[PDB]
Design a protein around this ligand. Structure first.
Ligand SMILES: Nc1ncnc2c1ncn2[C@@H]1O[C@H](COP(=O)(O)OP(=O)(O)O)[C@@H](O)[C@H]1O
Length: 381
């Protein structure tokens, strides 16, 4: 026997899967052709679309396109963290005897779903993707939950795998995976103090990790659970909403769809802003048939979020305090999280540790997956 054993990075927002076949951990590409998937589950009149095609339909299907599934998993309905977010989603999360589900309308009927199977649904597609490129049925996986996950959330995110059909070997911490990606545990026989800076698409996770000879210990976590990628897009989306409104003197705001088209355009823009210094927002017949055609500077950009971009440096210290370690004591700075591609966030942190070089060679949206797959081979039999 042998069996392809994949490591999956289930995200909050996006999830990436990857395997390591003889020598390299290759990161299973996507049907549309991406190294990701946005963690989106949609129910319409005909079908239930997971992955990308779901995310694309969220304007034209608001009330019945479920997402941010990972924020519910683990908690009971009467929890605080659910009560706050309950006021921020186009769908409905209800209670069923203390436990929550998402109520939506699937193929004309009205059904309800338990977080672990909304999150399972993603795994299922994530499952298929592994099968697509490898050419065989994939049963073994290793999943990533953040450091702040308690048994409740683990036993659920473990359960998303079981229900997906997956036989989950072990279930590990994101920050840890990252450190393993870089082989920071493959060490040189001293003690190790490592730092993880995930800056997701919705979550800012910071961790300071001690490797005491081959083994990790999870030291101190920290961050803003509502600061992230989308927020950055919101500042852009909020800006152009203004520039256009003032260019024509016609406000778009309360137009659910006009809003989204710009949205996805600001996203596209922001990403290239990490290499190029100029973005180009090009949306045809946006609103009242008017076209929108403009640009945004990388300069202009960094100043839009500047208040937020800058502020992240704060938890770095804050963990480092609880961690009972000085800036210097860290032997590794690992840039995990997609958003860490923004060069403004990069230098801010690189300056913060005073010139130190940053561990950023692997694509900050994959990284947590890379190890997930690696830690798998070891566990693979
Ligand atoms: N080249 C890029 N430049 C800037 N931001 C990016 C780039 N690529 C992706 N992002 C952003 O990073 C976020 C994705 O991080 P994500 O993959 O969700 O982390 P996790 O998987 O830990 O949730 C998205 O909001 C996306 O817009």
């Amino acid at each position: 026997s042998k069996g392809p054993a994949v490591g999956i990075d289930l995200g909050t927002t996006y999830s990436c899967v990857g395997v390591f076949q003889h020598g390299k951990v290759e990161i299973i590409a996507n049907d549309q052709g991406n190294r990701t998937t946005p963690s989106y589950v949609a129910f319409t009149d005909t079908e239930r679309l997971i992955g990308d095609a779901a995310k694309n339909q969220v304007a034209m299907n608001p009330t019945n396109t479920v997402f941010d599934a990972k924020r519910l998993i683990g908690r009971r309905f009467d929890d605080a963290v659910v009560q706050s977010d309950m006021k921020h989603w186009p769908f409905m999360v209800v209670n069923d005897a203390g436990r929550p589900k998402v109520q939506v309308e699937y193929k004309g009927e009205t059904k309800s779903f338990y977080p672990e199977e909304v999150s399972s649904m993603v795994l299922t597609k994530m499952k298929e993707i592994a099968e697509a490129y490898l050419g065989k049925t994939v049963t073994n996986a290793v999943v990533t939950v953040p450091a702040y996950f308690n048994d409740s959330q683990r036993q659920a995110a473990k359960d998303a795998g079981t229900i997906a059909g997956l036989n989950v070997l072990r279930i590990i911490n994101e920050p840890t995976a990252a450190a393993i990606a870089y082989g920071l545990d493959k060490k040189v026989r001293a003690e190790r103090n490592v730092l993880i800076f995930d800056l997701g698409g919705g979550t800012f996770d910071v961790s300071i990790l001690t490797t005491e000879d081959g083994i990790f210990e999870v030291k101190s976590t920290a961050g803003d659970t509502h600061l992230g990628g989308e927020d950055f897009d919101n500042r852009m989306v909020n800006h152009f909403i203004a520039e256009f409104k003032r260019k024509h003197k016609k406000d778009i705001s309360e137009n659910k769809r006009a809003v989204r088209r710009l949205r996805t355009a600001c996203e596209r823009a922001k990403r290239t802003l990490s290499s190029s210094t100029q973005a180009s927002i090009e949306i045809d017949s946006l609103y009242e048939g008017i076209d929108f055609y403009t640009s945004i500077t990388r300069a202009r950009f960094e100043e839009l979020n500047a208040d937020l971009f800058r502020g992240t440096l704060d938890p770095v210290e804050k963990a480092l305090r609880d961690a009972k370690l000085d800036k210097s004591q860290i032997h590794d700075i690992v840039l995990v999280g997609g958003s860490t591609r923004i060069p403004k966030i990069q230098k801010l942190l690189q300056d913060f540790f005073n010139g130190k070089e940053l561990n950023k060679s692997i694509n900050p949206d994959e990284a947590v997956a890379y190890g997930a797959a690696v830690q798998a081979a070891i566990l693979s039999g």
